[PDB]
Chain length 90, copies 6
């Protein structure tokens, strides 16, 4: 029940699924979302302790950058503001 | 406060960074996250005018280096009542 | 009034700025905000012909350097009742 | 009438203008406004053959310079029954 | 008949012309019209192989100069049963 | 089987051709067809690893020259439990 947030955005769903797979395999993080953003952007989101989310996002970024049209963003917010939480499925 | 702050980004990840930075930057409420179509994503905040100013300014600085980056950073100090349904 | 003002933008932030400038410029009611697809957004107002013209001029000026800017500014003074379902 | 007239535009604003000019130029009824994706908008009218011919032409001239403009202007005087679910 | 015919266009208007020519060409049933996203529109038909052959040929010819035109024209004579839910 | 196969295409017609060729080339089941946005279409199959491998290989070859063609062809042999909700 760490509250760190890990995010990877990709071009297309296939690199996003690869990313989430690699993230949840690399460390103890829970997948909490997959968003079809519009325009072809897809974002996957995970939660965990800071160290695990760090390891997960590095792993996801590495795994998906060469899949399909690839990686757009790979970002960690280690302590999201309470206001941000509804955007994360709360 | 009824002042409105808005940041538009390319993709969701810079939008969440913007929202985080905005809400840590000053006393503002995150009231909206919009998938606009075509990859645009907008986040909206409300608060007193001075707070919304600092929030949007921190928001723009934070998300402009994230993902496909920043499109718009804007403030409306006194939004018309007619606009409220769209918020 | 039954006159129609429309502004189309690239992104939601210029649309919201347009809608605010429009409703502040004259006695016009904001009747809608449409996410068109591909990033197009359109805001619609109704009022008397002169009011609507003032409103759209103001909204076109206000939003053209906001975010990815302005696509269309258009006024239909007396819409056909066939079109009203689209409004 | 059962003739079908179609105009496709980039953005919603020229679609509404096309629809308004179409329904003013001849007795035709607006039966549809479709957000197609990517920013395409299609407006659909029905009526007698001559009406629909007059309508589509007028709609094409009117919306041609509005916003990001006109994509398609087309008439099918008697759509096959199998086409109706695709409108 | 289990043969499958498919035409993909840029915009709805060429897709409707494709549909009309396809379904008038031979005895096929229009099982779908999909808004794919980004402006792609796909129309799908079923019938016996000869009918679908004739249909898809007719449709490709008719729509390729209409609007932003034709993307794809394809026939699958005997689709796998696993694909049927997608159909 | 629990291995996952995925082909991503531009448009629905190459996607359906992929799906057909995948399920004909090996014992895999088609679990999904997703309209991703912007015109991306993903088809997803499950099966044993060797089968999913043969399936995606064939699907990639089959759809690459169809319509606007192929974007991605990827296998995940042992998908994490956490990924299952996205499938």
């Amino acid at each position: 029940m760490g509250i760190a947030l890990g995010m990877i955005e990709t071009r297309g769903l296939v690199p996003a699924i690869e990313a989430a797979d690699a993230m949840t395999k690399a460390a103890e993080v829970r997948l909490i979302g997959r968003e079809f953003v519009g325009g072809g952007y897809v974002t996957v989101l995970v939660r965990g302790e800071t160290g695990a989310v760090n390891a997960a996002v590095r792993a996801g970024a590495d795994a998906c950058e060469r899949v399909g049209d690839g990686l757009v963003a790979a970002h960690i917010i280690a302590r999201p503001h309470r206001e941000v939480e509804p955007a994360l499925g709360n």
